[PDB]
Design a protein around this ligand. Structure first.
Ligand SMILES: Nc1ccc2c(c1)S(=O)(=O)NC2=O
Ligand SMILES: [Zn+2]
Length: 256
């Protein structure tokens, strides 16, 4: 599986039949269909004690990994019951500034989308959490091209060291608060992982307010490679799944 013609999203259902399931992600967020829920509590993002460890090119995206062996960076509140622990973040992006996000907003595609992945601590570890319908909470943040995001630049600068699949680099003392917009207003709905195995385990929490990154920052994302060292260069671009049918679901908004 990957993102090309021959093994991209339209093919994934053959190995992963859940691809055509009842709660697949991403979706288009139709802002005028979403229901404002005055009872959704504010989101609590508690990243003070976050301990970043490593950055890895996995052949599909790059992942910034965290020490999740204790409650140190956690998401609570909003639509969530209990405490969800940050494990990793990664992005999805385009070959052009006009595409790259997975979620869309009134069919608008952003240049990229950040996903901060958390697991429900009632399930003990990530692997058990993904078997549960409320196992994960993914905080999704859109990226638009404009001004640079200074809190992204440490990431951008290490990409050269992980150009190809399987490469990793120590990535300590990275503060993911630097990647958040000002507002924590959000939409939320029940969905899935957006890559195989496409498990239907996610509560999505998608911020309304995009962050702005520079063109130069996103260009550096686009210099990464899907292939391994020594193989023909296939640029890591357009690593996004397109919108899937909403089916029998409701999107709730935290704001009017
Ligand atoms: N645990 C996860 C593993 C991979 C992915 C996700 C979660 S995502 O945030 O749905 N987008 C993904 O690629
Ligand atoms: Zn993702």
């Amino acid at each position: 599986w990957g993102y090309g013609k021959h093994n991209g999203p339209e093919h994934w259902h053959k190995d992963f039949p859940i691809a055509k399931g009842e709660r697949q992600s991403p979706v288009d967020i139709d802002t005028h269909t979403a229901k404002y829920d005055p009872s959704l509590k504010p989101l609590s993002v508690s990243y003070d004690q976050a301990t970043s460890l490593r950055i890895l090119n996995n052949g599909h995206a790059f992942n910034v990994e965290f020490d999740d062996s204790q409650d140190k960076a956690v998401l609570k509140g909003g639509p969530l019951d209990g405490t969800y622990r940050l494990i990793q973040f990664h992005f999805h992006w385009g070959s052009l500034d006009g595409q790259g996000s997975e979620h869309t907003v009134d069919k608008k595609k952003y240049a990229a989308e950040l996903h901060l992945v958390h697991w429900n601590t009632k399930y003990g570890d990530f692997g058990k959490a993904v078997q549960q319908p409320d196992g994960l909470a993914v905080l999704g943040i859109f990226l638009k091209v404009g001004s640079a995001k200074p809190g992204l630049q440490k990431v951008v600068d290490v990409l050269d060291s992980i150009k190809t699949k399987g490469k990793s680099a120590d990535f300590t003392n990275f503060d993911p608060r630097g990647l958040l917009p000002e507002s924590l207003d959000y939409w939320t709905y029940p969905g899935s992982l957006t890559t195989p195995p496409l498990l239907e385990c996610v509560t999505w929490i998608v911020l309304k307010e995009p962050i702005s990154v520079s063109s130069e920052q996103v260009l550096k994302f686009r210099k990464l490679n899907f292939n391994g060292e020594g193989e023909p260069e296939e640029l890591m671009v357009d690593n996004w799944r397109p919108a899937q049918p909403l089916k029998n679901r409701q999107i709730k908004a935290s704001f009017k």
